[PDB]
Symmetry: C2
Subunit: 776 residues, 2 copies
């Protein structure tokens, strides 16, 4: 172990949790950014599995009778493992074909169906050139996955082809149904020829959103929806049942909440008779989880049915973990298998989490268990209630923008989850303080830093509302670390919807404290300009009186042809508080330098004609030399190399630059033999990044990453030698998701570390050896 | 050039002997300390600078030659020194070698006629350090050549009697007239000092000893104080003040208006009183009453028309800056008018005892404005006793006996004698000790040990702190200050000890208190002549204290047993990674390095592991690169290790089972040749290679300091580096540290740089940057 994770567990949208039918307590989890995790203790702890070509996983299936053979459906196609998920290989027939369901023929594990699909991730189906519209197809293997046949069930190239489920008749293994936006289809020869099943009301709601079939094969359950381009605005899915011997649908929503996106129904494999247990959650909607009971008679008539919430709002009966997400959005839900020694239970989620319910057949009760985070003995106070801090169970799937550390305190600023805070060095966390009174949540935190309020170390943060990275505005908050404990509180200083302190509403893509005067804080409001808090102690003095001290505007950026309009990273000068650098990503791009004059006025100018949306600049001092380091595209004549991002270095504050790292350097230090995905999607890979470069003392770090495909090439550490040259080494090591949004060199407990945040796998740190620092 | 050793002190803090104005240059003054030699200032005390190296640093007198401000005489316990470069360097006068001198006086009109008088002020407990005795013949060294040679003039033949001379004063109106004031009595010469004979005092039956004389500038009136002939000043408290004309010996007591029963001494006439009205300045030794100025109006027939005494300095009332040393009323143990030459204005130089103070004079008012000339107030305040007191940074002198130091972030504490808890919140620049004054006459003036503990995650100062002056600590008390804010708002609370044995901790002084590095909530302490005790968790002890309750300490070792037990600890060294193991250096009962090991049942077994000895012997235990080091600074050690009374550095890497010599006096003399010591040729034959402590170990670094407290001689500070083959290579790091004897040293990282913090038995706290140090990450 080299890279050390510091996360509270999970935190990203979970696609599925799949049980191994051959052995109780063995489960796999499909993440949308880090691939597949495995557990052999029913989710008490999770371990990463082998490397996939694409990490956006929609389906995992374990071969009945062979736990070593596992199939994984990803956005780029099907993978097969023959060593129990230790290693994976892309299946050539399905390359560039997103797969989201995998089903085995009952009694013949060599007969497999893998169906094109992508769950609700319509936003991502085009990342590799696919479209939602196309012929309706499935892939069928009859030799256990060595070869696959392409079967067409609909030939309309202009209609949505997403398949949501494939389900076999347990009582007649050659009968199989599929549920698709194309409709529900049936095959009586194992999936080689299909016929369409008419829906309950195809003129109005033709799209199927999942089917279920009773084990005796006699009853089909389905939900149906109107045709609309985006699930965001398609809210009412209705639930129906029909006998399969004569298609005649009846609506069976009596007892369900109205106007919900019910999907992926599923019959308990234990329902072998005329009473069927049907598990029903939904995409997006938060209502917990339903179990329905349908009592048919032997005439094929439904005597009665009833839906029961077996999971509901937070009420004290289950540990919600750190992710206070109530009611649960049960975006997947499965009964446990009847094989392998499994007990009867339910696997589900609150959306970003993993939950397992055990079942009491005496009183038909469910007991929900947190399978993503572990509470510690530390407590935080919020809503007048005490909540534990939580340490991860082995997974981490958060989009983390930035990180700051002071003594025992760590904060990572995340998308979706906002202010993620730790008071034990990053072992356990809580983000409860981001849920503010008045009904708004500080769910997007793009920058954090540590300032100085009259000698008291004070966290500063760009913290605003908005999910999925859709930050609403620039908004500056501060937390005085009086106790380095959960008792410390956040207060708002500037920005927000109310334009507090005269700070405009443009997002502060970075907030930076001056190392020379840590009371002074710089921030760049997107499309407005660069602003400054001269002394944060004075700003808090006004705040404590119920007043507000205005911020100072030091640069105006409102002209696209002449001004820098957006900044990604601000680098104050390490020793001169009247000089700052920033990387401009809007208007006139590149590294900009500003200098304050005696009358307090500033002059700004471009010092490197670079570009790139996530371009960074860093300035530090080491043994008498001030280094200026740019990670970006371009640079001008003699430096630009197409759209390749490069590391450029200057020792004279940006008047002269030297190219010290390129993609060719990266490939020589870390050959493409190290990348499982090079042969298949290397022709698409672009040498860019999400950020994550840093410099301190004699060390420099960077990471090549292409967010278009969630592909990370590697992490590279450079050592500045006594003569000026930089020698580079590969420090990727065991970091499996290596793209980086930010990196900082941080000394903790007398040892120098590299703290790095990732756009999908949270926070990691790594020991750095042989480092020299200036005494500071 | 530049500086290496960096002082961190509030200013002065030790008994001040004198402040002498340069008559040739206004605002030029010299200060006589008893352990730092002579300080100089050219801005009338706004800032002080060190001067040249003396052979002995107990200075009793300083005099600048009239007409040549570059020739300066300095009287010390070992004799007169002479500088010809304005105090930059000194040479010891050979005729006065081993002769304590406390008075130097020049002849008016001819500065080549000088008188140097044997003396030692009130330092009767120090006159014997180099073999001298208080009893002896009354004698005086006189020179007619400006200092080339000195002849010994005897004015009393009795060797049964005390010969201390207090003052020597010429007659400004006829330069060959001069008097001296001595425990012999008042003697007068019309010779310029070649023959003398005794003047009868006012009542030699009861009070034969004169404690200083003063002569009016016209030579016509003499003032004096006379004392009983009792040696110990603690039981001789009633000095009486008299006046006589010099035409007829006819003493008149002139105490009316003075406080009764005071040790009045060193009277002085304002050189401006050239007529028949005299202003007389009068302070005292020990007694605290401020400072008197007396006015004597004589008429030409020769009688005292009238006289009155007025307090020109008094109890603190807010009208003068008392500085950090809340010492009120002032004990004006010296007081001098400013000269009339050199452009000086009229003023008074004096002290509250450990300080330096200057008063300016308003003539159209007869008011004095007292100015703090030892420390500088900052803008930080300490709230105490309904008043907000500034913190104070030093003006260039430091004279405190400091036992120990502890640092956490911006907070620094010096544990001192006399001045108790000396605390800083800006890294040691400025200080306050006001919190040691607890009220009701209960002052924590002696703090022999400090450390930083951990109370539920909050760093917490722990201290042995008790009443008593001059190092006479009354008992052991454990105090704790939680550093909630690292600011003067943090407060001390007493956890255990005292005369009522709070928490079951007995009354013996906790000569050391040490926190376990493996578990910083656990604190060890050794109560002198009782044993070793433990606070298992200081947070839990504070939980009880905050409820108005007390959690008992734990006894882990009885030290009641003279022939079997260790009974006094000088330093406790808890094991760096195993909280069940503790070492300490025993300096009472069975001496040496002892090791205690906690067993399964919770009991402890202790045993001696080195047969060392020494009152200030130290032990240090630390870890570096997989080795646990145990280092002793002491004499002895047993067969193969003992070498007479020489202190040595012994090292062990197996918890004291086997030891090796790694530094000896021979190694020190090779690394730092005696060529570096100005005192070697005079008193080097007396120097013993001992120490007051100040050894330390951390990472690949070991430090020690050779120092003989019997003569206040420091040989040097030595730093050893642990090579990868296990051997230690030593270097001299004395550099500009002029007082280099040490009571404690700690290696401390501050803002990314390793520093050595060392406290000294007389010059406060100093720190030095340490290069090439490597630590285990922790
Ligand atoms: Cl219904
Ligand atoms: Cl001493
Ligand atoms: Zn998704
Ligand atoms: Zn940032
Ligand atoms: Zn004295
Ligand atoms: Zn100590
Ligand atoms: Zn308690
Ligand atoms: Zn005993």
């Amino acid at each position: 172990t080299v890279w050390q994770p510091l996360n509270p567990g999970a935190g990203g949208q979970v696609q599925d949790v799949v049980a191994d039918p051959n052995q109780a307590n063995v489960v796999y989890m499909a993440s949308d950014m880090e691939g597949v995790y495995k557990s052999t203790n029913n989710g008490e702890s999770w371990q990463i599995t082998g490397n996939l070509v694409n990490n956006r996983v929609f389906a995992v299936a374990v071969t009945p009778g062979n736990s070593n053979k596992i199939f994984v459906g990803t956005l780029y196609g099907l993978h097969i493992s023959t060593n129990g998920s230790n290693s994976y290989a892309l299946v050539p027939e399905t390359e560039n074909k997103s797969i989201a369901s995998i089903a085995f023929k009952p009694g013949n594990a060599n007969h497999i169906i893998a169906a094109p699909g992508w769950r609700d991730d319509d936003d991502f189906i085009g990342k590799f050139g696919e479209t939602a519209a196309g012929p309706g197809q499935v892939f069928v293997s009859q030799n256990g996955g060595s070869s696959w046949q392409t079967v067409t069930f609909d030939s309309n190239s202009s209609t949505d082809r997403n398949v949501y489920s494939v389900v076999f008749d347990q009582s007649n293994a050659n009968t199989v149904y599929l549920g698709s936006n194309k409709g529900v289809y049936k095959s009586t020869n194992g999936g080689l020829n299909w016929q369409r099943i008419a829906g309950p009301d195809d003129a109005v709601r033709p799209w199927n959103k999942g089917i279920a079939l009773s084990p005796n094969g006699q009853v089909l359950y389905a939900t149906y929806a109107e045709a609309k381009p985006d699930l965001r605005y398609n809210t009412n899915f209705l639930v129906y049942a029909t006998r399969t011997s004569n298609i005649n649908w009846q609506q069976v929503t009596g007892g369900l909440e109205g106007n919900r996106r019910y999907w992926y129904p599923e019959v308990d494999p234990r329902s072998t008779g005329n009473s069927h247990k049907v598990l029903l959650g939904a995409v997006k909607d938060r209502f917990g989880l339903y179990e329905g009971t349908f009592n048919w008679d032997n005439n094929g008539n439904l005597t009665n049915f009833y839906w029961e919430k077996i999971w509901d709002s937070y009420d004290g009966s289950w540990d919600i973990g750190w992710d206070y997400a109530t009611p649960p959005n049960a975006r997947f839900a499965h009964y446990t298998p009847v094989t392998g020694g499994w007990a009867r239970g339910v696997w589900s989620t609150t959306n970003q989490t993993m939950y397992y319910a055990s079942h009491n057949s005496g009183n038909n009760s469910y007991s929900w268990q947190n399978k993503y985070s572990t509470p510690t003995s530390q407590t935080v106070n919020w809503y007048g209630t005490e909540w534990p801090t939580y340490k991860g169970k082995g997974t981490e799937s958060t989009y983390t923008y930035d990180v700051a550390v002071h003594e025992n305190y760590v904060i990572q600023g995340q998308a979706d989850n906002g202010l993620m805070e730790s008071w034990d060095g990053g072992v356990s966390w809580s983000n409860m303080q981001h849920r503010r009174g008045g009904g708004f949540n500080l769910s997007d935190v793009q920058a954090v830093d540590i300032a100085d309020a009259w000698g008291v170390p004070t966290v500063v943060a760009q913290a605003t509302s908005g999910y999925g990275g859709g930050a609403h505005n620039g908004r500056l908050w501060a937390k005085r670390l009086n106790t380095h404990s959960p008792a410390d509180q956040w207060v708002e200083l500037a920005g927000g919807p109310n334009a507090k302190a005269g700070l405009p509403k443009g997002v502060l893509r970075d907030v930076a404290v001056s190392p020379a005067n840590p009371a002074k804080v710089f921030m760049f409001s997107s499309n407005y300009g660069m602003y400054m808090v001269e002394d944060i102690g004075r700003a808090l003095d006004y705040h404590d009186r119920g007043e507000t001290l205005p911020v100072t505007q030091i640069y105006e950026g409102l002209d696209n042809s002449n001004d820098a309009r957006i900044a990604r990273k601000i680098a104050p000068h390490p020793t001169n508080e009247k000089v700052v650098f920033f990387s401009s990503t809007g208007g006139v791009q590149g590294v900009w330098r500003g200098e304050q004059q005696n009358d307090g006025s500033w002059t700004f100018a471009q010092v490197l004609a670079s570009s790139g949306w996530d371009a960074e600049v860093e300035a530090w001092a080491y043994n008498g030399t001030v280094y200026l380091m740019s990670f970006a595209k371009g640079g001008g004549p003699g430096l630009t190399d197409g759209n390749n991002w490069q590391i450029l270095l200057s020792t004279d504050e940006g008047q002269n630059w030297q190219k010290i790292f390129t993609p060719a350097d990266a490939m020589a230090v870390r050959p493409t033999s190290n990348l499982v995905w090079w042969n298949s999607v290397g022709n698409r890979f672009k040498f860019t990044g999400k950020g994550g470069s840093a410099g301190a003392g004699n060390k420099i770090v960077m990471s090549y990453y292409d967010h278009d495909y969630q592909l990370g090439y590697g992490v590279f550490l450079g050592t500045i030698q006594s003569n000026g040259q930089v020698n580079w080494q590969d420090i990727t090591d065991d970091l499996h998701f290596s793209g980086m949004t930010s990196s900082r060199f941080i000394k903790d407990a007398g040892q120098m570390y590299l703290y790095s945040t990732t756009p999908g796998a949270g926070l990691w740190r790594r020991s750095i050896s042989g480092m020299n620092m200036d005494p500071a």
